[PDB]
Amino acid sequence: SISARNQLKGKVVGLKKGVVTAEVVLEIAGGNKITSIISLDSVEELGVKEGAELTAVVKSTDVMILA
Amino acid sequence: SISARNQLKGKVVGLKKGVVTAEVVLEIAGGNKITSIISLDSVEELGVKEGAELTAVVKSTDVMILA
Amino acid sequence: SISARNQLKGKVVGLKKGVVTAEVVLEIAGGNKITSIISLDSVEELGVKEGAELTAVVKSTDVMILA
Amino acid sequence: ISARNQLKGKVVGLKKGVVTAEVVLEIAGGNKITSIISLDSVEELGVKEGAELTAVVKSTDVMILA
Amino acid sequence: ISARNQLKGKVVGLKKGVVTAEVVLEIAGGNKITSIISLDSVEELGVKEGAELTAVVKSTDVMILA
Amino acid sequence: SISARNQLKGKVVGLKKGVVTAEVVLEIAGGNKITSIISLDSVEELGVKEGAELTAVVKSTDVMILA
Ligand code: MOO
Ligand code: MOO
Ligand code: MOO
Ligand code: MOO
Ligand code: MOO
Ligand code: MOO
Ligand code: MOO
Ligand code: MOO
């Protein structure tokens, strides 16, 4: 119910922990890949792991268009 | 060749022009929908129209994770 | 259950609808005013109105420090 | 500045990485604000625990949860 | 402020919508900067053509093209 | 050919690699310093190095006005 209009359901296939940030790579429907860099705290708090089923969220105003 | 790690190839199915911004809705592979709000200038300059084939770009650091 | 680490509860004191986006000002702890600019579409589906209790959400990576 | 979200608080956490850094400020009512910025900024503004600072956020970066 | 991108320029365009507004500043070397902010900010900072202002951008929002 | 309206040409004067992200400082017209924090992965694939000419890109919606 949050306004972010892009919610892409997917599966974690890559995970890399840094000191402050984290990188979560999801395999989503149709064969596309989504790359997320978020805080390492949210990554540990949400219990993300390779194979977990997750949703990638993106606010519309953060989406560019390439012709 | 730009760093934005999320490039989702798709087809414009919705277009709405505002005064300063624009909303471009793409149908992408696998049946997902992407919603873009960008400037109405880039929308007119790139020549976006319903049915055009476009790529949605999203910088990794703008992607959240929902468990 | 989203990685976005900042989630500030409040009540809607401001609502302005545009053509593509819309403005939502929430009053949070301490009378602090939070202003959110989102899609017109999102406000309508989330049924936002003056007095509604909603939560404002911000990804850490959008949060700057002013000294 | 144009960013309309400016919240005053007290540094209650600071995590320094290699490129970025986390600052956790406690603002009015016990809410905590998490900010990830550049290490460079954390060295230059003078950020440390106990310090009073303001969290700034651009409106268009704020989502709404119903 | 922590945002490390602060470019000084002169307002050469201003477009007012209902909720947001476009400001186009000309900075050093003829480059133009496009910024979409809240109408509210455009009314309060005092933005108009000819005015000198600074464009601010957070590092983590800047992409790189090779 | 991307909607991102700000594209500032420059030469790399700064490069710092982290674990998940990396920092790139470009020198543009007027000696102005632009700092970009992106994914470590992106810097490696784009082969970024001191002295490289690259273009910094920013979406309008991330650009604030300081008075
Ligand atoms: O309606 Mo949104 O929060 O700009 O995707
Ligand atoms: O040094 Mo990081 O890759 O910002 O945790
Ligand atoms: O490497 Mo990026 O520009 O943070 O997606
Ligand atoms: O009033 Mo708009 O929908 O920001 O052009
Ligand atoms: O970058 Mo976060 O971990 O979604 O606040
Ligand atoms: O008017 Mo702002 O810079 O989108 O908060
Ligand atoms: O990410 Mo910064 O250090 O607020 O420009
Ligand atoms: O919001 Mo834009 O039209 O990608 O600069």
Of F22, F61, F67, the CB nearest to D19: F22
Whether the Cβ atoms of residue A26 and residue A49 lie closer than 8 Å to each other: no
Provide the CATH number for the domain around residue E58: 2.40.50.100
Chain F contact set for A16 (CB, 8 A): 19-20
Q: Which residues contact F19 (CB under 8 A, 6 or more apart)?
A: A16, A17, A18, A19, D17, D18, F40
Whether the Cβ atoms of residue F6 and residue B2 lie closer than 8 Å to each other: no
B42 and F1 in contact by Cβ < 8 A? Answer: no
F43 and B3 in contact by Cβ < 8 A? Answer: yes
B23 and C41 in contact by Cβ < 8 A? Answer: yes
Q: Is B1 in the pocket of ligand 3 (CB under 6 A)?
A: no
Ligand with minimal distance to A40 CA: 5
Whether the Cβ atoms of residue D33 and residue D9 lie closer than 8 Å to each other: yes
Ligand with minimal distance to C58 CA: 5
The domain total for chain C is: 1
Q: Report residue B13 as tokens.
A: 């199915």
Closest-CA distance, C31 to chain A, in angstroms, reads: 23
Range of the domain at E7: 1-66
Q: Which residues contact F51 (CB under 8 A, 6 or more apart)?
A: F11, F12
Give chain C's end-to-end CA distance (angstroms, integer). 31
CA of F61 to the centre of ligand 8 (A): 7
Q: What are phi and psi of E61, to 5 degrees?
A: -100, -5
For this PDB entry, the determination method is X-ray
d(CA B17, CA B38): 10
Bridge partners of C8? C56
Resolution of this deposited model, Å: 2.5
